[PDB]
Amino acid sequence: GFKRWYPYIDNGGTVIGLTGKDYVILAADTRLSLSYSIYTRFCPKISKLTDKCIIGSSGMQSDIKTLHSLLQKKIQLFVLEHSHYPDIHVIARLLCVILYSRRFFPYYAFNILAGVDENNKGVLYNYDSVGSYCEATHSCVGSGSQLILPILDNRVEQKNQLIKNTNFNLGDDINFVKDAITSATERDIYTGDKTLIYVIDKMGINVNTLDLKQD
Template sequence: MTKQQANWSPYDNNGGSCVAIAGRDYCVVAADTRMSTGYSILTRDYSKISKLADKAVLASSGFQADIKALQKHLAARHLIYQHQHNKQMSCPAMAQLLSNTLYYKRFFPYYAFNVLGGLDNEGKGCVFTYDAVGSYERVGYSAQGSGSTLIMPFLDNQLKSPSPLLLPAQDAVTPLSELEAVDLVKTVFVSATERDIYTGDKVEIVILNAEGERREFMDLRKD
């Protein structure tokens, strides 16, 4: 048992894992469906993924009440934006809004760790990863939640580009095809479920591309 698992608190509910991978013309966002507190599983079928716009999907891990409050606030701000501009926010615009929202609450922050995925104005996949107070960056892939310390080394091994100190800097998107990215996401969740007690039951996968959105589910360990 890890130190993180042993020293749990009531604010750890809805731990789990969230992953996003950006490709040249797609983005994959995934999260498990287990919500738990300590050693008690509250539900095995809870979605950690929220669709903020047609081309922006948010996956969050942390304290359930704070996550719901954050999603409600973002939905209200997006509705105001649509009335004012007669269009939906792009994923990079939503990323900036999320950063501003988290930073505004920095002295009493949302206990929420977020990864935002979608498509930019050029149709490329984009992933933005955050800390609790709004610092963010655009990356090719990211993971958040209690299983992220297990998942990120796996993704680094499979997707990390060569050092920009040795070669010209490469694009942030990953070289995998859409199907390869989905298979990789399924693999990392199977691996994380073996070691993280807060990750399990099912993985929900959202794929965004030029054709729209589709969802897939895959069963994980339930113990």
């Protein structure tokens, strides 16, 4: 006979977020993999939702694309119906309900919402596949998350250090994001090729790239 087809596949990759006082960094590698082969070395995981809000996801690429496009559609409809752009918090709740609407046949997507609210606070929300979400100062989804989250805990919170550091700034935070993603690339077979680093601050959204290892 024929076995029942499984509707899920992990296409790999990592998304990393880090808030500041007035900025948020969201970075993601661009590899797209299938089992132990590479579909393509350039498949961006971050989509722009608003001038002040982006979304980055890891998991099944078809699900991520559909969910990003659905969220963009819903947000444009919201703008037309209500005359204003939704804040990051509104989008966070909307994404929660969208994910939970499939509670019993979930999207295979782990999503980080990054943006700056009206008060110019850097904001991060990170999600599970069924809609659970929480606000955080740094987060990471995808194959490399269990490698990266300890590093950012150590650097940002410093809970286990008596002599602490309190000099945080955008350049150092970006350097930390780059080191975290490179260290993850060192050990996670599904993270590599190239990373896009998005920075949101007062002016708006800015994009830069960093090369990762190819093996």
